[PDB]
Design an enzyme around this catalytic site. Structure first.
Site, PDB file in Angstrom:
ATOM      1  CB  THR A  18      94.220 149.116  15.092  1.00 45.51           C
ATOM      2  OG1 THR A  18      93.314 148.695  14.063  1.00 45.51           O
ATOM      3  CG2 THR A  18      94.104 148.188  16.298  1.00 45.51           C
ATOM      4  CG  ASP A  38      90.984 145.780  14.341  1.00 47.56           C
ATOM      5  OD1 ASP A  38      91.748 145.775  15.332  1.00 47.56           O
ATOM      6  OD2 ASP A  38      91.292 145.260  13.257  1.00 47.56           O
ATOM      7  N   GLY A  92      96.432 150.793   9.090  1.00 48.13           N
ATOM      8  CA  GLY A  92      95.451 151.823   8.800  1.00 48.13           C
ATOM      9  C   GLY A  92      95.523 152.974   9.812  1.00 48.13           C
ATOM     10  CD  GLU A 112      65.117 142.548  16.179  1.00 43.42           C
ATOM     11  OE1 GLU A 112      65.114 141.989  15.059  1.00 43.42           O
ATOM     12  OE2 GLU A 112      64.183 143.271  16.595  1.00 43.42           O
ATOM     13  CG  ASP A 160      99.753 141.317  13.238  1.00 41.90           C
ATOM     14  OD1 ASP A 160     100.143 140.829  14.327  1.00 41.90           O
ATOM     15  OD2 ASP A 160     100.014 140.794  12.113  1.00 41.90           O
ATOM     16  N   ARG A 197      87.690 142.941  10.633  1.00 41.53           N
ATOM     17  CA  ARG A 197      87.953 141.697   9.939  1.00 41.53           C
ATOM     18  C   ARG A 197      88.593 140.874  10.995  1.00 41.53           C
ATOM     19  NE  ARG A 225      98.023 147.757   1.905  1.00 41.14           N
ATOM     20  CZ  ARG A 225      97.478 148.019   0.711  1.00 41.14           C
ATOM     21  NH1 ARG A 225      98.193 147.948  -0.420  1.00 41.14           N
ATOM     22  NH2 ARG A 225      96.186 148.352   0.651  1.00 41.14           N
ATOM     23  CG  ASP A 272      92.251 141.258  16.284  1.00 39.88           C
ATOM     24  OD1 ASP A 272      92.928 140.610  17.129  1.00 39.88           O
ATOM     25  OD2 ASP A 272      91.707 140.705  15.286  1.00 39.88           O
TER      26      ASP A 272
END
Lengths: 319, 319, 319, 319
Positions: D125, D127, D11, D187, D103, D171, D72, D129
């Site tokens: 990325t 995220d 992405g 919260e 990845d 994800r 992709r 990860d």
């Protein structure tokens, strides 16, 4: 302890409110009262103290400035001044103080600790020059304030009007300039921690114009000198029309970024941890991406440094 | 027509790209080719002209600046330069021209008009000082750029420094100062279109500090004078520490607001319609929230005014 | 009048605080006291009323939401509640009321005047769905919150993830979707005031894919249906990976734009003027770029429309 | 080396452009040519390769997305695809490849180097990860995109609508939810890597309401579940009206923050250093605030963790 205090000193820095909130919420989580001290050390001497309830720090995490305000206090730079402050603290039953701010605020924390009163410093300033920490609370936000101007200036360039000088904050430290300069694609960056040759600067500018570079951005730390002056200076050397922007105190305002809010939350909470563990006379920080604390006196002994490689890189990328 | 052209002239103005996109897409919708003229009227004379495919105005609606660039063209203030321009247009089969820009751009459009060449002027500038329109494309965005600064400055206030001067653009027009001043809660707004008295400015400032007003913000249109001089005058008369921000060309940059994009899109399409309808020597705009067009020379003879009631209001609200 | 009141009702809207500031400052400018009524009509009934000083509306012009809060009050939709509100207004010496809110809040304004309380309604809503006004306070800001999302989505397109649906607010009005959609370059805008055909929507997607359009952006008004449902129907119909944003109540939040602060300031002040002129049962607005006021009942009998030209333009430009 | 290539995969991530710029400019500085590979590995296989000149990475530093595009390519996960990819590299005289992405991009880098083609991975990325780095390029920007939304929701809290669920990306990884949660004063934060129990979530809601907390903001990582689902559960269990925002791919979009641009600049340049100094089969990162590189196979073998103390802290503070 059963009751601690919290204040802000130095110029406003985005994230101070995030830090006040962390201090109040972490203390209250451990059953400790927090009293707000308003107008920094001036308000301390004057007795501007009032309980901060759990909801009184609600809806401030995202807000710029400081709800406790900030004031100068040359009085606290004296023993008569420090004496009355301790009296006001004893009077209100406050057993330890979290001080949030710059170089100034740490000296007061040192002096209170010298007078046997538990106190921890939290680094709250936009210029990044507080020891015991890689990053100060406010620095990240200030960089994003700077690059917002740099990005807008990139839309306004023309073939005739293509050279821009931006004067950024930073007393004595080139961190804002270096980091904002790298992030904004600056060709030249003038900082106190690196020698610059204006001829080397003029050559760069001409080489870039010669190879078809649409525009050149030059970032100047206020601690190196005036941008309005470097602007006039570059024009009459090169003949190039040069526009200067002086950003000023907008760099201290605004809602804090995600990193400044996280840093503020983590460092505020750690200041409370230290006071509750009976470990006053320290300052908190992040170093090598880890939370740290140091003796204030030792920390203050350290000279401020910038990453010289990053400075060299910024030159390389802007060819 | 089979083919038309478009260019940008004057400083950069947020929404110029949304304007270009609209001219190109509207023309192509009606089966008309569009050719970009790069670098304003200078590139027109130089023959810097390239077809814009459907295609080439993708992912520009949200981008500041102009993809066609802008430049200065003294030549086009002459009969000789107008004729080289018309020859390049003929040379390239361009039957009509849309000019997006300021008063410079309108004068050239009127000249091409006197010369028989169909041209439509679209108001692209931040200063709002173009006739035949209540609002120019870029004005709203500039207002928002100004108030970002003012908002950040509010967070920066102390007892020590509570007095701020911001110098905004406008050239000869006080629109940016008036509207941003009102939006920002400015105590004093200095504009070309309305008298001010410095002693009344000083009197209101003290009156405000008295009643506990946290800070005073003063906006100065650049056409009135220099923020630096006004801040000095105020510091030297009241003794209050006065901090000046001069925003500069940051005001011409940035992604346009919703309103600037809508206006740009409507006015651009309307401009192409007028060419295809067999008109020329018109300028488009929005007046009383309706789309309008007018003879260029007639429009140019109108003097610029601001809403004086809004100016009075701004005074009433800052008590 | 010696003393008036002000409350906010309906959903939060950017610029409600600017309008409250203006009512307070405009009243105080004329020697009138202003009492804040918290939690809308619910607070009126409960007697949650507190005098507002000049400085209590300091540092709110730039803040989103409402310092007075809003609540739903069914008690006020009936004749006993209404006269409850009346004893509390008399008990606090309040001779007139400015209600800043949407449609529902106007109803209470009308009924109150009949019982001998001049009330003036000010349009504070993001929906833009109030008669007697071209624009409501908070609408422009909502549009800029929407295009923020659209602009970011424009950076994210790939070959496989190329089709985006964003669901926007507006209740039963298509103004947010229409204006957001034009400003954001949306290929399809689904609104309640205009017929749409899902086949044509799918025809348009394919035409754009076949001609090399980098992405297709679809804006869905909440009054038409669910973004998640539309997105899934498109992906099911076409095999095109479709990504869905639902912004929700984000659109009611944030700092108001320059335009919303100005309109808020002008309209709020106008309401106070009407009250002091001896008028009541009116609502204020902007129509054809001119401040206007109308009888509340007359105004409410009108039907809200959108500009069908702007809807057709949006089609023509997104080819 | 005399020629390298650069590619984006996965992405979009804010800062990919800053990274592309850094790779091109660092190579050119050392007299090495850089060829751009368009559309990731798919484009590599198709031969969609074009020299990038100094100026071709001009005005991209501040831009979201990627100028080289992303696509992709499952075929690159096969022996044939690696063969055809290497054939295109060799055909174009490219001696090493920088891959900027997630990845998928790193697995491709590993395979390349097993096939004896030099390749370095750069972490791109939102995220966070990706192994070998504390932070990925785009993560900080995504955090700021999320808190913009949280900040706006704080303005909209009525008494009957004071419960908000915001679904964020990540994800597998809870980093966005955790960091934006803490920064946003959430919260409750639901992440894959820490346990939650709906009983605790509901108890916390009620516990805050009774104490007078103005609103509850719940952040849900998409890897935990659907925001719409959680919102329904909360409303159905408590009768508290709950509103839901799913931001979606907005999080991958926008102009990178200062930190992302600095990180992208430092990490892109290091990738070039490794290729030029005869390394390959590596990835770069920042760990403990120090620039680092790792064998890709070794780094890929590491499991991602989040800071559990930060998570615990987030709960302590949001009482």
């Amino acid at each position: 302890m059963k009751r601690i205090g919290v204040l802000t000193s130095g110029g406003a820095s985005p994230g101070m409110n995030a830090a006040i909130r962390s201090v109040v919420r972490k203390a209250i989580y451990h059953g400790v009262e927090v009293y707000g001290v308003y107008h920094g050390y001036a308000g301390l001497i004057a007795g501007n103290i009032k309980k901060l309830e759990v909801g009184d720090v609600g809806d401030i995490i995202h807000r710029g400035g400081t709800i406790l305000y900030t004031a100068r206090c040359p009085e606290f730079k004296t023993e008569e001044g420090q004496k009355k402050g301790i009296e006001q603290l004893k009077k209100h039953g406050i057993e330890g103080l979290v001080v949030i701010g710059g170089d100034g605020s740490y000296q007061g924390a040192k002096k209170l600790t010298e007078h046997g009163f538990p106190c921890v410093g939290v680094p709250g300033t936009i210029d990044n020059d507080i020891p015991g920490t890689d990053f100060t609370i406010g620095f990240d936000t200030a960089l994003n304030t700077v690059i917002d101007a740099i990005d807008k200036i990139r839309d306004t360039a023309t073939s005739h009007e293509r050279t821009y000088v931006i004067e950024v904050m930073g007393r004595h430290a080139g961190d804002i300039a270096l980091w904002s300069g790298l992030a904004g694609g600056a060709e030249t960056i003038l900082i106190p921690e690196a020698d610059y040759d204006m001829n080397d600067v003029i050559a760069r500018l001409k080489r870039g114009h010669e190879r078809g570079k649409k525009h050149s951005i030059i970032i100047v730390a206020e601690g190196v000198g005036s941008g309005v002056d470097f602007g006039r200076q570059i024009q009459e050397a090169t003949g190039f029309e040069t526009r200067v922007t002086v950003l000023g105190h907008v760099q201290r305002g605004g809602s804090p970024t995600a990193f400044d809010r996280v840093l503020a939350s983590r460092l505020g909470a750690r200041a409370v941890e230290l006071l509750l563990e009976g470990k006053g006379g320290r300052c908190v920080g992040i170093q090598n991406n880890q939370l740290v604390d140091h003796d204030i006196a030792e920390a203050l002994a350290n000279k401020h440094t910038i990453d010289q490689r990053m400075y060299a890189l910024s030159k390389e990328l802007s060819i």
